[PDB]
């Protein structure tokens, strides 16, 4: 309406310095354009879906610059256009994709419970013939399985699509959870399993986790301490609190009397 805007839209610019000024300009224009959904005159669906698109690609740049608050911000803003009273709004092709990125965010932020409760709306039977649609639910299902082997073996199955790097980011943010769980060591473990489970010869884990967990290292073996070494009480204190409970019993049994 105001101008073309299609010039710098489809164009991919590595530098986000100009994209930031363009973004701010878009904010200045959309400022009086009533971000909130409007059913008035019904002809505003064009500028609404246009704003939806530029906020979608804006979210693409937002996740390109790796901005956590901005991403969930634009996702919360686009969720307004995603959930609406009128069903006359056409379904975008990148809608389920960006929603998939939202699932990625929920998985990365350990919000995956909200993902589980979000699992209801996604099977809308709109397409279902695409592997990308069944990808996040199967990956999270494998996460419920806990097996990192299937993911690593199916890592080469991902097509030429460019979110593979974001999947690598997902592995990068879940690696502390996986390694954190496998290194728990209720009793003890042997290094021969560690060779298989842990990553390659690059000393990232043996460095970081050494200053993180702060444990002792023996002759090529991982030792675990503070396991079931906890000493019980002297039975004096729970006897006292039980006496207090007896007093409370005297109260409740006889108060009004």
């Amino acid at each position: 309406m105001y101008e073309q805007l299609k010039g710098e839209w489809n164009r991919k610019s590595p530098n986000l310095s100009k994209c930031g000024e363009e973004l701010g300009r878009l904010k200045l224009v959309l400022l009086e354009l009533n971000f909130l959904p409007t059913t008035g005159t019904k002809l505003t669906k064009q500028q609404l879906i246009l704003a939806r698109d530029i906020l979608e690609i804006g979210a693409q740049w937002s996740i390109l610059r790796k901005d956590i608050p901005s991403f969930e911000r634009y996702m919360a803003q686009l969720k307004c256009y995603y959930f609406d009273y009128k069903e006359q709004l056409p379904e975008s092709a990148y809608m389920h994709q960006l929603l998939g990125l939202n699932l990625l965010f929920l998985l990365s932020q350990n919000r995956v419970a909200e993902f589980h409760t979000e699992l209801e709306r996604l099977p809308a039977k709109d397409i279902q013939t695409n592997v990308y649609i069944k990808h996040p639910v199967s990956l999270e299902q494998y996460l419920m399985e806990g097996s990192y082997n299937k993911v690593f073996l199916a890592k080469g199955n991902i097509p030429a699509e460019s979110y593979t790097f974001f999947i690598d980011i997902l592995l990068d943010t879940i690696r502390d959870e996986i390694a954190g769980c496998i290194e728990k060591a209720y009793e003890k473990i042997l290094f021969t399993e560690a060779t298989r489970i842990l990553f390659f010869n690059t000393p990232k884990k043996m460095t970081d986790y050494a200053k993180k967990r702060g444990w002792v290292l023996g002759p090529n073996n991982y030792y675990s301490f503070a396991s079931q070494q906890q000493k019980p009480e002297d039975t004096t204190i729970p006897s006292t609190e039980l006496a207090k409970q007896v007093i409370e019993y005297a109260r409740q049994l006889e108060m009004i009397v």
Binding site: F35, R73, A76, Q77, K79, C80
Partner: protein, 187 residues
């Protein structure tokens, strides 16, 4: 319009408040529909309420006060309600206004009773805007007085000069004084 939309939260957590203004204005429309959505933004509202950075304290104070009696006790709501500073509100039949002025009056006369047995010393500070918003509705009900609650509220407020302007314009003065004493002897 919006219900489960989390966008206004991100907008409330966002800088350059000039775009936050109309967002809060539209928030005041749906705040009656859903008060649970503002619950996560309550803390940030308090934060922006504390500092003097924002120009309008009443805009945040209203939202805080209305979401507080929806969430927690009426006390915390009344704190920001009476701490809203200068506020212009016309008389309405809505539940919110009548309830917050109900708690306002109740707590006012409560403090009056608490300060009744202490004529001198350790006097609690009393804001002028409170007396203003109280005496506004008080006078509004004191127009014709409706020959019932005038002397009642005049007595319940425990103020010395409050009932002197009530007897200025009245019908059947001896009857009004007799009714007044009859009301005063039964308390």
């Amino acid at each position: 319009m919006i219900t489960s939309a989390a966008g206004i939260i991100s907008l409330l957590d966002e800088d350059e408040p000039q775009l936050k203004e109309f967002a809060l204005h539209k928030l005041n429309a749906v705040v009656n529909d859903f008060w649970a959505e503002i619950s996560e933004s309550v803390d940030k509202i308090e934060v922006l309420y504390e500092d003097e950075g924002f120009r309008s304290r009443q805009f945040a104070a209203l939202v805080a006060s209305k979401v507080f009696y929806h969430l927690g006790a009426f006390e915390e709501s009344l704190n920001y309600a009476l701490g809203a500073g200068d506020l212009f509100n016309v008389n309405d039949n809505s539940e919110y206004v009548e309830t917050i002025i109900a708690k306002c009056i109740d707590h006012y006369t409560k403090q009056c009773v608490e300060n009744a047995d202490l004529p001198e010393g350790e006097k609690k500070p009393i804001d002028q805007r409170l007396e203003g918003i109280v005496n506004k509705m008080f006078q509004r009900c004191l127009d014709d007085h409706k020959y019932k609650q005038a002397i009642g509220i005049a007595l319940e407020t425990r103020r010395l000069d409050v009932f002197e302007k009530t007897i200025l314009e009245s019908n059947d003065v001896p009857g009004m004084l007799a009714y007044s004493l009859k009301l005063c002897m039964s308390l």
